Amino acid sequence: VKPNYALKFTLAGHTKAVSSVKFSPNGEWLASSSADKLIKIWGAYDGKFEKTISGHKLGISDVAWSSDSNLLVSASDDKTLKIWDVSSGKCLKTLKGHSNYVFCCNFNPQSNLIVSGSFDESVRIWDVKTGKCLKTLPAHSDPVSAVHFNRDGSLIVSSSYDGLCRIWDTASGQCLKTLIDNPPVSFVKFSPNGKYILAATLDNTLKLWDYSKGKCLKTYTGHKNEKYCIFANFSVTGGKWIVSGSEDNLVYIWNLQTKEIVQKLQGHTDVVISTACHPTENIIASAALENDKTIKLWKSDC
Ligand SMILES: CCn1cc(-c2cc(Cn3ccnc3C)cc3c2CCN([C@H](c2cc(C)ccn2)C2CC2)C3=O)c(C(F)(F)F)n1
């Protein structure tokens, strides 16, 4: 079994590299952030441009949706995060505290909290309602490349250029495990069932780790990844795949269990820095850096 993702739409509008794309949890929208300091919202199914959201004073590295699809948070080189009301485009809150670029962000599933990671080597946990920083974790000794809550919000996983992946208790901020401890760990994400962690290292390697046992279960290679932090994903709407961007301008798709490459999606003209999987349909969004600046939507039968 192999998917057959085919290109359906190319979305143009950003004037610099696109940094992150994310589907809304209700499946209706794709949000994109860019070095051009803008967030753009597009229809997830037909790619139609919906709106531009502006306000950050420097480029944006990352965006994330609340579970009810009504809020976005963005992480910017202006050292803030901003919380946006998607319907109005208005900035509801500016989250101040980080002392260097904010690189990565995520709501918890409850969406009462935001987690952020920064070039200042800290992980911060923010109250969505008030905009106040609740906790600052001295999480790493180099820039934080990823922060992600698990499926019930009780855990946070972080990764860093210091070579480490750490798992944190949300409630207390205490470190439960140092899972990886070494080249930079450029990306980390919990699996949908929370039992595994997908971890990228800047040596052409993606690894599936059993979080409870602390053991690498699978290794995925083939893609080019020596420079950039690239978003990877568990695709679960059809076959069980691993999806990643790549510095050779392709989207890579692997069989999660066999580790074989099952598809490479060709079309982008620069580094594919971001991929995202639709919540209910076999749809992938990909986005590329400044020689391309587009977002592409792909569809598969499985
Ligand atoms: C501010 C506007 N902006 C930000 C980015 C952006 C976006 C992503 C994708 N990303 C966002 C959050 N999570 C993920 C996976 C990865 C990177 C970057 C630029 C920085 N770097 C490297 C780097 C990262 C770190 C942590 C430390 C040291 N170097 C640097 C190139 C060597 C990335 O890899 C872009 C752009 F154009 F590249 F898309 N524009």
UniProtKB/Swiss-Prot annotation:
Interacts with PAXBP1; the interaction is direct and links a WDR5-containing histone methyltransferase complex to PAX7 and PAX3. Interacts with HCFC1. Component of the ATAC complex, a complex with histone acetyltransferase activity on histones H3 and H4. Component of the SET1 complex, at least composed of the catalytic subunit (SETD1A or SETD1B), WDR5, WDR82, RBBP5, ASH2L/ASH2, CXXC1/CFP1, HCFC1 and DPY30. Core component of several methyltransferase-containing complexes including MLL1/MLL, MLL2/3 (also named ASCOM complex) and MLL4/WBP7. WD repeats lie at residues 13-52, 55-96, 98-138, 139-178, 182-221, 224-264, 267-301. Changing residue 77 to A: Strongly reduced affinity for histone H3. Significant decrease in interaction with KMT2A. Contributes to histone modification. May position the N-terminus of histone H3 for efficient trimethylation at 'Lys-4'. As part of the MLL1/MLL complex it is involved in methylation and dimethylation at 'Lys-4' of histone H3. H3 'Lys-4' methylation represents a specific tag for epigenetic transcriptional activation. As part of the NSL complex it may be involved in acetylation of nucleosomal histone H4 on several lysine residues. May regulate osteoblasts differentiation. This is WD repeat-containing protein 5. It is found in: Nucleus. Changing residue 257 to A: Reduced interaction with RBBP5 and reduced ability to stimulate KMT2A methyltransferase activity in association with RBBP5 and ASH2L. There is a cross-link at residue 16 (Glycyl lysine isopeptide (Lys-Gly) (interchain with G-Cter in SUMO2)). Changing residue 77 to N: Strongly reduced affinity for histone H3. The record marks 77, 103, 231, 290 as: Important for interaction with histone H3. Changing residue 103 to L: Strongly reduced affinity for histone H3. One of its GO terms (cellular component) is histone acetyltransferase complex. Keywords: Acetylation, Chromatin regulator, Host-virus interaction, Isopeptide bond, Nucleus, Repeat, Transcription, Transcription regulation, Ubl conjugation, WD repeat. The modification N6-acetyllysine is found at residue 82. Pfam families: Beta-prop_WDR5. GO terms for biological process: gluconeogenesis; negative regulation of transcription by RNA polymerase II; positive regulation of DNA-templated transcription; positive regulation of gluconeogenesis; regulation of cell cycle; regulation of cell division; regulation of DNA-templated transcription; regulation of embryonic development. One of its GO terms (molecular function) is histone binding. InterPro entries: G-protein_beta_WD-40_rep, WD40/YVTN_repeat-like_dom_sf, WD40_repeat_CS, WD40_repeat_dom_sf, WD40_rpt. Changing residue 231 to A: Strongly reduced affinity for histone H3. Significant decrease in interaction with KMT2A. The lineage of its organism: Eukaryota, Metazoa, Chordata, Craniata, Vertebrata. Gene3D superfamilies: YVTN repeat-like/Quinoprotein amine dehydrogenase (2.130.10.10). Belongs to the WD repeat WDR5/wds family.
